[PDB]
Each structure stands twice: as C-alpha cells, then as structure tokens.
Amino acid sequence: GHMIHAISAVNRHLYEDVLEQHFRLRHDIFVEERHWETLRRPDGREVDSYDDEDTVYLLALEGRRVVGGHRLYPTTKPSMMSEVFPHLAAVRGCPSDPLIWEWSRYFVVRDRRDGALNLQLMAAVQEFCLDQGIAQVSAIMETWWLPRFHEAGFVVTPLGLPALVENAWTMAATVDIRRQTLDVLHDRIGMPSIVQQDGPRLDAVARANLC
Ligand SMILES: CC(C)CC(=O)SCCNC(=O)CCNC(=O)[C@H](O)C(C)(C)COP(=O)(O)OP(=O)(O)OC[C@H]1O[C@@H](n2cnc3c(N)ncnc32)[C@H](O)[C@@H]1OP(=O)(O)O
Ligand SMILES: CSC[C@H]1O[C@@H](n2cnc3c(N)ncnc32)[C@H](O)[C@@H]1O
Ligand SMILES: [Cl-]
Ligand SMILES: [Cl-]
C-alpha cells in the first residue's frame, strides 16, 4: 500500500515534484496553520537553513500526493538546536555526532489526521534510523509531544529545562532508536516495513562523517 519514502541527495532526482509539493505544504501547515511567522516566505515555500544537500526527507506518499512527513538533519553540521535553541540543551549539551540526527517538521495533512498515518510516521523514523545505524534522533519540540512519544514507546532523554518559545512551552530532547520500539510499532501498524527507499543506496552515517 502507501509508504513513507526516504528522499535524499542520492535519489532526489526521482522526487523533485514531490519535494516542491512538500515545501508548499510546509508553508500551509507551519506558517498558515501553526502561525510560525518567522518561517513565512513570499514564494509560498517553507524552506530554512536546514533544507540543503544533507537533509533527508521521510515523506508519506499516496501515489505522488504528499500526505505527511518529517525530516532528518546531521548534527555534525550546525543544527537548529546548536544555532537557534542551544539554551534548551544547556544541561546535557547539544548533540554533535554522525550517529545522532536532528528530527523536525513533522506533519500530517488535515485529510489524514486522527487515522493510521500518524503511527506510521512514528514507525518510519525508527525504521530508517535503524536501517542506517543511526543511534538517536534529537529534537526541539513543544511539550505536548511527551505523551505522544510515550504512547509510541519512544525512549526520551530531556537535554535541558523546558522554556517558553514564542508563547509555547518547548524543550530539547533525544529519542533512542530501538529495534524493540520498532518491532512493537510494526505489530501495531500491521506492516513489516513502512519505509520505501527507491534509487541509489543512501549511506547517511558516511555522509554525516564527511561533515
Ligand atoms: C519531530 C517532532 C517531534 C518535532 C516537530 O516537528 S513538532 C511540529 C508539530 N507539527 C505540527 O504541529 C503540524 C500541524 N499538525 C499536524 O500535522 C498534526 O496535527 C500532528 C501534530 C502531526 C498530529 O496529527 P495526528 O496525530 O494524526 O492527529 P491530530 O492532529 O488529531 O492530533 C492528535 C493529538 O495530538 C495533540 N496535538 C496535536 N497538535 C497539537 C497542538 N498544536 N497543541 C497541542 N496538542 C496537539 C492533541 O492531543 C491531539 O488530540 P486532541 O486533543 O485534539 O483530541
Ligand atoms: C521548533 S519549536 C517551534 C518554534 O521554532 C521556530 N523555528 C522552527 N524552525 C526554525 C528555524 N529554522 N529558525 C528559527 N526558528 C525556527 C518556529 O517559528 C517556532 O517559533
Ligand atoms: Cl530553495
Ligand atoms: Cl520543526
């Protein structure tokens, strides 16, 4: 059926129209729904400094329609946490490791909310990272994510004190990538695999080491 596609520099030649579609959806969702005004752009494309040649996109596709997704960025490069929110990780420190990738821009289009897609996206990050040998993901997230992580069996390590970010309680954390976590989620989503990887093989950890 419908899968989450891993899109990176090595295979984005197969996904250019999907990528542009998702940048516009990100504008509709993060700017026009969430009112994250600092991200507003006059081209109607929500693209930031962490959308470059090293970004990996995990996008939920129904045919060629983007219905959800999230992205991963190597912490061996300057990251959102290290550059924008380092104060959120003052207790434990901002991650910087080929085996830790920064996880952001999680979305589900309105048509697919409160359905099966959300748990599939949770499974997708675990599946991709385990495949790649990535040990943890790091994130800056609003505190309402904590019960969502717990519901999916995500092992969470807070990195600092929660703080207000533009009127919203926000925190920095890592999530442990676990085979055990993934196995339970595969059972729950009723599929042995949720991540589709078309085109040339991606060696994410090798690429992060170059950075
Ligand atoms: C990598 C990640 C950890 C860091 C991030 O990227 S944070 C960015 C979060 N993204 C967004 O807010 C984009 C706009 N929203 C969406 O795409 C979706 O609403 C999702 C957040 C993906 C959740 O979709 P899904 O689980 O399918 O279903 P729902 O939308 O009904 O949400 C389910 C329950 O999640 C909670 N929730 C979702 N959005 C918010 C919010 N803004 N503030 C507080 N709580 C929220 C809420 O409990 C909701 O259930 P109800 O209380 O509405 O019944
Ligand atoms: C990630 S927590 C949500 C807050 O982070 C902000 N944000 C998300 N991405 C970026 C970025 N690349 N640079 C600066 N602020 C950002 C949003 O505008 C919102 O205020
Ligand atoms: Cl661009
Ligand atoms: Cl984000």
State the greatest distance between any 2 C-alpha atoms of the chain, in Å, as a whole number: 44
Q: What's the token pair of residue 139?
A: 């994130």
Q: Encode burial over 36-69: b for 16+ CB neighbours within 10 A, e otherwise.
A: eeeeeeeeeebbbebbeebbbbbbbbeeeebbbb
Report the C-alpha gap between 74 and 101 in whole angstroms.
Answer: 5
Residue nearest (by alpha carbon) to ligand 1 atom 38: 144
Q: Which of 72, 52, 56, 104 has its CA nearest to residue 202?
A: 56
- Report the nearest-CA residue for atom 42 of ligand 1: 34
| Ligand 3 midpoint to CA 31 (Å) | 17
Q: How was this structure determined?
A: X-ray
Structure tokens at 5: 């596609």
φ and ψ of 125, to 5 deg: -65, -40
Task: Please provide residue 156's backbone torsions phi and psi, each rounded to the nearest 5 degrees.
Answer: -115, 130
Strands 168-176 vs 155-158: parallel, antiparallel or unpaired: antiparallel
CA atoms 101, 189, 7, 33: torsion sign: negative
Identity of the amino acid at 125: V
For this entry, resolution in Å reads: 1.9
Nearest ligand to residue 168 Cα? 2
Give residues whose Cβ lies within 5 Å of ion ligand 4: 104-105
Helices 117-132 and 179-189: crossing angle in degrees, nearest 10, is 150
The rounded Å distance from CA 148 to ligand 1 centre is 9
Spatial separation of the C-alpha atoms in residues 74 and 57, rounded to whole Å: 12
